[PDB]
Structure 1
Amino acid sequence: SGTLEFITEGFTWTGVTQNGGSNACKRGPGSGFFSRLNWLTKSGSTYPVLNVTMPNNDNFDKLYIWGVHHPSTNQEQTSLYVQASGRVTVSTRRSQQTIIPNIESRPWVRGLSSRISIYWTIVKPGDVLVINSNGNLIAPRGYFKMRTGKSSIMRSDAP
């Protein structure tokens, strides 16, 4: 694509707390998170079933980056998402990706045993993005505009 042109979208996330962060991902003196991702957690004592839609009315392909949180313990899972087992589904008119997060401890990396699994979806013009979640969703903040070009990437240590 040869570009990281990101367009922010509003996305209404009702009944949940937005902009979650961590000390593993500090921005400035305080905690933070991936700028292009939105960490959703429970609001009060409930994490409702999210059911948001974002249509593509433009004349181009949209690339969306989203993720799924994998807690290290069952208590972590419940403190964040209330329900013992979360679920994340993103869909379009022709395709679909469903994932049930697994609760599991990993070797400590940057003081953490938990992880996030990154996924991606492409939405063609006239198509619609549908996101459904009862838990563990790492929501997108918008999309990356896709291009077809003469660009590439190379691994090198040359000046």
Structure 2
Amino acid sequence: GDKICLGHHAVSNGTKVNTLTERGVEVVNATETVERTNVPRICSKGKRTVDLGQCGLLGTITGPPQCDQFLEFSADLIIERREGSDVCYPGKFVNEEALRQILRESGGIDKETMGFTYSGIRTNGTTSACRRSGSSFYAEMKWLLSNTDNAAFPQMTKSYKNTRKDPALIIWGIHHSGSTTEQTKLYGSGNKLITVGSSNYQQSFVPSPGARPQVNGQSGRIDFHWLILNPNDTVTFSFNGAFIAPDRASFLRGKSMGIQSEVQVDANCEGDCYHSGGTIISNLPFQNINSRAVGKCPRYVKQESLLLATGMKNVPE
């Protein structure tokens, strides 16, 4: 005779997933859990953005021609480019990456004169590696000479107190001339000493003239150095030549986030997870796009794919 029967649904085409117990079981419906789709632009909508282009982050502090428009920038988001260069006259920074990490999160910088003042020397030393229109130099810095070639360089001391509420970024340079005879034409003769102290920091420098391969037509080099001067603390500079003096000190504006990217800015899309090939916009817990992404990101995983069941076992005829 007559009866009642209960059952459940199914579909002709299910999706298969993994369980604890079996690999490739078919369920009515599933959903992805690992993000594969990148947006090939830096989604920057709503955020104060500064794209350094040709200026190197560290050049932001010393001031080569590329960086003139960035000596006092302000940003929530900072973008470094492959093309960017920290330098016009050839040289390096010591602890350069520490510095970059500080500057990336500073929210930008605010300059202020050291108020150094000079007598018994030249101040205007320039070079054709640093061209504005004709020979020029690091905008934040002063190429300290002796009155004309090969005059003596008269022992100097200069000091700067940090009278502000926050710590200062103090910078300076050591010049290594192509020759010993060049060191001479510039800063006179004999070997040269350059010391630097605070309440916090003791260190010391001698120049090292000699041939390097030429870079923007130069066999010489500048070594750049820096330290963080605490509020109320004083830095002093004892020196006798070969020295590249800071004209201005720097202060950090607030807070930001630094990225390195190869793609275009786009104020039409928003996101907080960035990598050099773009922005990962997604709600998902995981991603397989780029393990070096920075920001607020889904966790990077190895798998291309991990399906989460969102329905029952699929049982057809």
TM-score, normalization by structure 1: 0.92
Q: Which residue of 2 aligns with 1:6?
A: 111
Q: Secondary structure at the match of 1:154?
A: strand
Stretches of 4+ aligned residues off by more than 3 angstroms:
none
Shift of 1:91: 1.1
Aligned length: 157
Q: Secondary structure at the match of 2:231?
A: coil
Distance 2:254 2:203 in 1: 24
- Name which of structure 1's ranges 66-75 and 44-53 shifts more when overlaid on structure 2: 44-53
- 1:145 maps onto 2:243 in alignment: no
Select 1:158's aligned residue among 242, 250, 263.
263
Counterpart of 2:139, as a letter, is: S
Maintained 8 Å contact 1:13/1:50: no
Q: Secondary structure at the match of 2:261?
A: coil
- 1:100 maps onto 2:218 in alignment: no
- 1:42 maps onto 2:163 in alignment: no
Maintained 8 Å contact 1:74/1:84: no
Maintained 8 Å contact 2:196/2:203: yes
Task: List gaps (5 residues or longer) in structure 1.
Answer: none
- Name which of structure 1's ranges 58-67 and 140-149 shifts more when overlaid on structure 2: 140-149
Distance 1:98 1:105 in 2: 23
Counterpart of 1:64, as a letter, is: I
Q: Secondary structure at the match of 1:57?
A: coil
Select 1:18's aligned residue among 117, 123, 130.
123
Counterpart of 1:123, as a letter, is: L
Shift of 1:86: 1.9
Q: Which residue of 1 aligns with 2:137?
A: 33
Q: Which has the larger radius of gyration?
A: 2
TM-score, normalization by structure 2: 0.48
Maintained 8 Å contact 1:6/1:143: yes
Shift of 1:73: 0.3
Greater per-residue strand proportion: 1
Q: CA RMSD for the aligned pairs? A: 1.4
Distance 1:31 1:153 in 2: 33
- Name which of structure 1's ranges 136-145 and 48-57 shifts more when overlaid on structure 2: 48-57
